[PDB]
Amino acid sequence: QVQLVESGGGVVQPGRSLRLSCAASGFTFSSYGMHWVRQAPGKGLEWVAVIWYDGSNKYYADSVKGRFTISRDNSKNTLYLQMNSLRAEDTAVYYCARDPRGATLYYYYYGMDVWGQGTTVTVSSASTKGPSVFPLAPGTAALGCLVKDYFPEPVTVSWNSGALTSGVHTFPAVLQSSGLYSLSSVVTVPSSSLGTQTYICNVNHKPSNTKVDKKVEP
Amino acid sequence: DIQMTQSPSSLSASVGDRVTITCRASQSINSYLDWYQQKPGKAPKLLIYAASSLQSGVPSRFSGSGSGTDFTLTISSLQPEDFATYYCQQYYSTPFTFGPGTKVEIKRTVAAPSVFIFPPSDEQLKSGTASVVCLLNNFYPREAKVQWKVDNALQSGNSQESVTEQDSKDSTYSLSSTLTLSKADYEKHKVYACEVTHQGLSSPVTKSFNRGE
């Protein structure tokens, strides 16, 4: 029950600032180095910052140097990341991880051996907005739903209230030049069942408190 | 700073296979290298540290070697739970840099995509915009190319693609391409065509419709 719990994520306008917290428990926090690592949507792991077990020194990735500050409080078992002058390219899931750095087991034991769960930061000017849901009308037929112009992530889509799961492909959303997201969800069904079977995509966008049920018809 | 690279970018392997992937540093980093495993929508997990030491709790089929600028990670016998993305990371010098990752995916026979094209709905059109969708369904391998033509003229800059992860059941991928036009443009044209290129096809397949038929 060693655990790192991130918090502080959310939507933030470019140029504005945000603070992440990472609560540690179940181990001796003051004997571990700590890292922030981030992962942009669809991208690999990118390293952000490190700080040593006693907050001695701190180092930063070049792309965040001068704008981010890593800190820690060992009497609160917590690690922080102060993020200022946020840019679009800063949008990611942010992870904290602990790193023994030879403090334990072996003098060469260096690595991020425990991670938090991640917290999403989204940098954007866009306003919260629920999606429009358009049908993709149909021995096998394809049908689907186009879930368009929403902000922010995410939406969830199901078919016939979760009843229909085979042949369902719900694609990763794409960010449009508008700043609004779009995704489609499709399903292949036997051509025979059209007219006999009803197909309804269920879309919900919790940040808009929007829920839409769209019948997809031939 | 030190630059990390990996190879290959992706590899296709089967359960029971001996998998070997490599990591390269832009300069010598001695043995100061970590390997990580990450699965979609979850936190990375330390596999190897100091280039060859196994992290506690990690199956012995994993191992690692190298020192200086060249490193390898080897899975002696791939198990279903090893299909993931793997990252190296140097801690020799700050800033600490990850490699781009190597995606270990599930090999299957070639499968050509099934192509469907969808006209924009009446409902969308009433609101001034037209989206035309082309679906490439249940193909393997992942490399596929979609192209749009409107009245045989070649589109560019008005489409976006999305691809699913490898399906768990059949290990195929699916691809969505969306061609976005103004309602006014959409109605100045007749034939809309999606042309698909993929290893499973002898020659490209074209799906089209005529506007209002």
Numbering used by the authors:
A (entry chain H): 1 to 138, 146 to 225
B (entry chain L): 1 to 213
Which sentences from the paper describe this structure?
Tremelimumab is a fully human IgG2 antibody that blocks CTLA-4. The CTLA-4/tremelimumab Fab complex and free tremelimumab Fab were crystallized and their structures were determined and refined to a resolution of 2.0 Å and 2.3 Å, respectively.
As the exact epitope and mechanism are crucial elements for antibody drugs, we report the crystal structures of checkpoint molecules in complex with the Fab fragments of therapeutic antibodies approved by the FDA or currently undergoing clinical trials, and reveal the binding modes of the complexes and the conformational changes induced by the antibody binding, thereby providing a structural basis of checkpoint blockade by monoclonal antibodies for the treatment of cancer. In summary, the elucidation of the crystal structures of the checkpoint molecules PD-1, PD-L1 and CTLA-4 in complex with the Fab fragments of therapeutic antibodies sheds light on the molecular mechanisms underlying the therapeutic activity of these monoclonal antibodies.
